[PDB]
Design a protein around this ligand. Sequence first.
Ligand SMILES: Nc1ncnc2c1ncn2[C@@H]1O[C@H](COP(=O)(O)O)[C@@H](OP(=O)(O)O)[C@H]1O
Ligand SMILES: N#Cc1cc2ccc(O)cc2oc1=O
Ligand SMILES: N#Cc1cc2ccc(O)cc2oc1=O
Length: 288
Amino acid sequence: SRPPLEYVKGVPLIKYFAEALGPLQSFQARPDDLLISTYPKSGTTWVSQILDMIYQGGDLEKCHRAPIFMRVPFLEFKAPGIPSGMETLKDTPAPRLLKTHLPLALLPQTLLDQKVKVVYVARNAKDVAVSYYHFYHMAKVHPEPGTWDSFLEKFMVGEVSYGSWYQHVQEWWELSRTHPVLYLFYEDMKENPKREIQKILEFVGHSLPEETVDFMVQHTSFKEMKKNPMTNYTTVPQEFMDHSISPFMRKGMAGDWKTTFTVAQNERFDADYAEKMAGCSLSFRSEL
Ligand SMILES: Nc1ncnc2c1ncn2[C@@H]1O[C@H](COP(=O)(O)O)[C@@H](OP(=O)(O)O)[C@H]1O
Ligand SMILES: N#Cc1cc2ccc(O)cc2oc1=O
Ligand SMILES: N#Cc1cc2ccc(O)cc2oc1=O
C-alpha cells in the first residue's frame, strides 16, 4: 500500500513495474508494432485513443470493445490481481499498439532492433509536474506524494516514478535522429488537434476522409474522453485508482500550472530548468 520506489539501472520505478521487467525480457517486437512512448502525464491516453481510432478506421463502436489499457497493452504494467501488460499483450492482434514510459536505459532492445515506429509525446515540464502530483494522490501504487512543495523538489531531481522528465524528453528527442519517431507536443495538440491527427495519419501511412478526421477530433476531445468509460479509467478497481481523490481526466489544459506554482517555486524551477535544458535544441510552450 504505497510501497517505496525500487531503483533499476538508475531509474526509480513502481515496485510492481520493476518486477514486470523480468517477464518483459522475453518480449519480442514485430516490425509492424507501433510504440507510444511518453514520460507520465504528457498525453499518453489521448494519443492512444487517437491511434486506436485510426487503427479502427474511425469506427467508434470498435474503439468501445474494451478499455484503452486493454486495447493498448502497457508493456511494463503489473499490479496485484490485475493482469500484466505482458499477459494482455498475448491476446492482442497485430498490428499492435503498445504503450510504455520506460527510459531508454530500460527499453526492450527488440523495439529498437525491429525499427518499430514510435509516436512520442512531450509536454511542458510544469504542467507535467502538476498533473503528476494529482495522479500520485489518486493512483495508489505510488509512494505518498507529500506536500506540493516537497513533490516539486523530488520532481526536479527525478526522484519520482520513472525518473527525470529532463532526461526522458531529451533522450527520446536524440533517438528521433536515428530511429523512426514522430515527436509530438501536447501543447500543439491542444492548439490544433486536427493538424496533429493529420501528422499521425501521415506517419502511420493511412489516409482517411475529411469527415472521418473531423469525427476523430471530436471523439478525442477532452470532454468526450472524460465521459467515455473506455478511456477515462473509471473501470479500474477503486483499490488502485480513486477518482473521488482526483479524476484521471482532470483538467486537460495547457498553462494551468500557473494556479499551482508559487512565484518562489517558479523562480527556482526556471533557473534549474535553464541549466538542465541548456544543450538541448527542444523548445516547449508553457501556455497557449
Ligand atoms: N483528450 C484530451 N485532451 C487534452 N488532455 C487530455 C486528454 N485526455 C487526457 N488528457 C490529459 O492528459 C493527462 C494524462 O496524461 P497520461 O494519459 O499521459 O497519463 C491529464 O492531464 P491533466 O492532469 O493536466 O488534466 C489528462 O487530463
Ligand atoms: N481491472 C482491471 C484492470 C486495470 C488495469 C489498469 C491499468 C492497465 O494498464 C491495465 C489494466 O488491466 C485491467 O484488467
Ligand atoms: N495501478 C495502476 C496504474 C498505474 C499507472 C501508472 C502510470 C500510468 O501511465 C498508468 C497507470 O495505470 C494504472 O492503472
